[PDB]
Paper text:
Transient Receptor Potential Cation Channel Subfamily V Member 4 (TRPV4) is a ubiquitously expressed, nonselective, Ca2+‐permeable cation channel that belongs to the TRP family. TRPV4 is widely expressed across different tissues, such as the skin, vascular tissue, nervous system, lungs, kidneys, and bones, and contributes to diverse functions. This polymodal protein can be activated not only by environmental stimuli, including temperature, hypoosmotic conditions, and mechanical stress, but also by endogenous agonists such as anandamide and arachidonic acid. TRPV4 is involved in various physiological processes, such as osmoregulation, inflammation, nociception, and temperature sensation, and plays a vital role in human health. Dysfunction of the TRPV4 channel is implicated in various diseases, including skeletal dysplasias; neuromuscular disorders, such as Charcot‐Marie‐Tooth disease; cardiovascular diseases like hypertension; and respiratory disorders, including pulmonary edema, osteoarthritis, and renal disorders.
One of the compounds, GSK2798745 (GSK279), developed by GSK, is undergoing clinical trials to treat pulmonary edema associated with congestive heart failure. It is a first‐in‐class, orally active, highly potent, and selective blocker of the TRPV4 channel. In preparing this manuscript, Kwon et al.[ 13 a] also reported the complex structure of hTRPV4 with GSK279, which is very similar to our hTRPV4GSK279 structure with an RMSD of 0.86 Å. As an analog of compound A1, compound GSK279 exhibited a similar binding pattern within the pocket, with stabilization facilitated by aromatic residues, including F524, Y553, Y591, F592, and I744, and the polar residues of N474, T527, and D743. This observation implies that A1 and GSK279 employ a similar binding mode within the VSLD of hTRPV4. The simulation results of three independent replicates for each antagonist revealed that compared with their original positions, GSK279 and A1 are relatively stable in the VSLD pocket, reflected by RMSD values within 3.5 Å. The resulting EM maps of hTRPV4A1 and hTRPV4A2 showed apparent C2‐symmetry, whereas TRPV4GSK279 exhibited C4‐symmetry. Indeed, superpositions of the hTRPV4GSK279 and hTRPV4A1 with the reported closed TRPV3 structure showed that the three antagonist‐bound hTRPV4 structures are in closed states.
Author numbering:
A (entry chain C): 203 to 337
B (entry chain D): 203 to 638, 662 to 786
C (entry chain C): 607 to 638, 662 to 741
The structure:
Amino acid sequence: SNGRNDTIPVLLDIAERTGNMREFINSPFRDIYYRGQTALHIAIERRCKHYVELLVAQGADVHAQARGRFFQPKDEGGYFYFGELPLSLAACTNQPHIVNYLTENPHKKADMRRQDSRGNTVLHALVAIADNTRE
Amino acid sequence: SNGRNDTIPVLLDIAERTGNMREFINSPFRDIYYRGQTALHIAIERRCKHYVELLVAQGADVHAQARGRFFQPKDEGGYFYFGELPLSLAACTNQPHIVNYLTENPHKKADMRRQDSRGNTVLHALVAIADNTRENTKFVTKMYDLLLLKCARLFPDSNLEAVLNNDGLSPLMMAAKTGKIGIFQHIIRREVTDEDTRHLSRKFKDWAYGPVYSSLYDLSSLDTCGEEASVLEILVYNSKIENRHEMLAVEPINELLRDKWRKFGAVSFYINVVSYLCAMVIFTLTAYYQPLEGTPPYPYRTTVDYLRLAGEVITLFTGVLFFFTNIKDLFMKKCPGVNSLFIDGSFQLLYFIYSVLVIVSAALYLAGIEAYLAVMVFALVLGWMNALYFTRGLKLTGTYSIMIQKILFKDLFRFLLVYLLFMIGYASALVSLLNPDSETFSTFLLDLFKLTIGMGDLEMLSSTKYPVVFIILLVTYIILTFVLLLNMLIALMGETVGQVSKESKHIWKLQWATTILDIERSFPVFLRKAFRSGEMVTVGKSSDGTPDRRWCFRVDEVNWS
Amino acid sequence: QKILFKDLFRFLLVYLLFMIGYASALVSLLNPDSETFSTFLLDLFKLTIGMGDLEMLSSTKYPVVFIILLVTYIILTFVLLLNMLIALMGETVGQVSKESKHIWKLQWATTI
Ligand SMILES: CC(C)(O)c1cnc(N2C[C@@]3(CCC[C@](C)(Cn4cnc5ccc(C#N)cc54)C3)OC2=O)cn1
């Protein structure tokens, strides 16, 4: 709602207070359609730098691979292939600042060299989404 | 004078002082030319907001219908049709402020739902005046949205688009068959961001994930499966020919047609093609297997006679089915004219002639032994000609069919007319000179016809009364026939490709769409519901909290901005 | 290559449709062989080229109808020839002339 949800810090506080924050903050989806997607992917896609910061500072996995049927190339039954990785996701949605934060941060740094299941690195992904349209 | 006439207040004062203001303030014209027009119409047309206020504050009728011969559509002997109503008048002359005043005022409010004599609402009128010119479209679409939102907000229960005229159409349907792109696409693609009146949108945004926005269009009216006079059937059959190719390119109609093609269109068309070719192979086999010796009816005792009878009866069944399916189609659709025969109208003629020939030949086969054999030959010829109909399914073959039809019709008869003019002139020239029969004309025509092809023999030069003149005449014959051949060539090489090549794809698109819709209309009602395109999405809670549940149709896009 | 492939088979298919229709029309009218199809095919083919002899008009059961059918054969075969001319001669040069250089470039590169 208007770029801010007030229940996020409360839910995080509950997460450490119950003692199982790690299982909560990065909980992959189980359906074949959205398999592997974590809250970090949603935070990056919604274009909330502050939310991705507060989410990774609490221990979000920055290498979780969203490999569901939705996150597949258009040719193999999917609507968006962004490289199957949070860094590749922030790269493929034109989010330079979130990428800068993801590459250098005190808590956990996502290196550019990591490959997804297909082997595609960040640059293979950035090629994959490219069109011949100028924009 | 300069927007102010000082005699109006004193005239109104005289009107109430004489005790008969009511009969004066709204006095209709009596002539057939301006019948019904009141002073309120003049005040609105002259664009005097303060005058219309001062005129209605004293009791001007805001529902008086100006129905004279001048206020009629241009096609019915008139110069301006604005909806036959003061509110429709202020709407059709781009006067938003006067409309705002008329809709809400302390004295007397004119509701948007009132229909004129034709049944046209304010929105039917606003469609009627709309043109495809942009300077018209900016205010037509804008003020259509204005009036629709105002009617929704004032009256939440009713839908202003949902009231029909005396023709049964709705503003979208009326814009479909009149050829008003500017308001047609604006009606289809409209979306209302405000939650108060968002329910009357026709394009909703289902979900988004980065640069993949899947908005889904509403086809509650575009595709009714033969229940509510669908817009698509109107747009393909009864719309304006010159603009139809552009109306069929709107965002949710092209994809809808493609979906209906892949869902049940390809398989049904192809099985129809295969069945037609099989039936025609059977027809040819029956035609060849017929024995030429004997007067019908033949004694059917041999198994070969049984297969001959089976072929004959299946041919008659095919012919009667053709008659049944062609008469109904012509009965349902209007008789076409120029620029629409090349689309679809031509084939109802040809198949009609095929069925008629087969039936009359069966009638002669009943009695005439020698007679019936004449038009089996014509029947096979014409049927194998009509086999060209089904090329419209494939784009590459569909265009070439248009080539053949246009060459056979537009220029073939022109060239034949000029050619026959030369034949009659030169035949009367040559034959009248000879010194001796009536039948000599028939021989000479074929002789010259062979000479044009090159198989003519010039041995008749000896019998000519004047040998010198006939040599020159034959030379001019050959030269001018060559000139006419070059004329037909040159027309077909420049003027045809200039127009027909571009128009061929457009005509094939219309042919494909009308065949899709004919295949759909072939199915029964329950079967069509099974092959209903789109989802059954729930868009939102209604004014009472109930779900919408409107049969929408999703198309997804990729946007990087 | 494009003339041999894209349009030649289209013309052959339409022309085959026409030959089968008109041959089944003509031969079924004659009053008597199975081999008569082969003779009629070549004779009509020569007639289209112009070396066909029209001596079978005497043997026709109905002389009047066959004259009309032969006239239609000639006219619509001429129409088909005009149609092929016009198609390959407006629409092909619209596309292929531009496409020819592009295809040659790819051929040259792949041969290198
Ligand atoms: C072999 C068999 C029995 O399946 C068959 C049936 N009909 C014909 N045609 C096709 C046709 C041609 C002219 C347009 C028409 C009137 C449009 N039209 C009207 N209703 C339709 C239903 C489906 C299609 C398709 N595809 C077209 C339709 C149909 O006139 C005939 O005789 C030929 N063979």
